[PDB]
Every structure is written in structure tokens, then in C-alpha cells.
């Protein structure tokens, strides 16, 4: 596998990608996402935020809270292992984290967090074995 991920987020409500796979070889990783629709923020932002599994809709909930300028991510929420900023159309963002953070055998969701996204967009992130 590969240390670096990119993902690309539509008008319609999709990711491309559903698995990422971290090499173990990797002390940080890299995730790109790029929103290649021609909606707006407004209308159709795109984030990827990354948690645990069983964390995923509690996270969301929060984010809906937080509000579009804090990325729909509440802030210091300590069950985010990264996150991206909130994207429209002909935008991209990146983020970086410690591969530290992911452990072998569990399961881990990147999902989208503006309001109402996260049951449509989501993936399983995992560390390579
Ligand atoms: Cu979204």
C-alpha cells in the first residue's frame, strides 16, 4: 500500500473510493479530497473526517452542531483522528496524521460530516497486514 490517499467527493453525494488501505510502513498518511462537482459549500460541502467506527455518528451529530465554520466538526472532539475543512466545488484540501493513532484490527470510518452527508459517504480506512 501506499502512504497518501486521495478521494474525490461529487454532486452526488458519493465518494469514489470506499477502502483505504495505510501501508504499515508509514509513519504519517496523507489524505487529499477534492470535490469535483460545481456545488457549492452551501448546498453540497464535503469534508472527510476520520474516527473509529463506532464513533462515526456521534461525531457527525456533534458536527452538525458545530456549525460550517468549524468544518462541521466540533472542535477539540478528541474521537477525530483528522479531518479535512468543509470543500464546494473546484476545491480540494489535505490533511495529515500519525499513523500512531490507527491500530491493526480495528475498524475505522472516514466519512463526510456536513449535515446529513455521513449515511451516503463514508468508507473503511484500515492499516495494511
Ligand atoms: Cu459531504
Redesign the pocket.
Known sequence: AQCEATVE?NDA?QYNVKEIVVDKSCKQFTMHLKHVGKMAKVA????LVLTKDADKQAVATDGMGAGLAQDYVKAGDTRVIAHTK?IGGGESDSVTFDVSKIAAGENYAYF???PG??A??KGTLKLGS
Not at 44 to 47: F, K, L, Q, R
Open positions: 467527493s453525494m453540497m460541502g464535503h469534508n468543509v463526510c460530516s456536513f452527508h455521513w451516503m459517504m
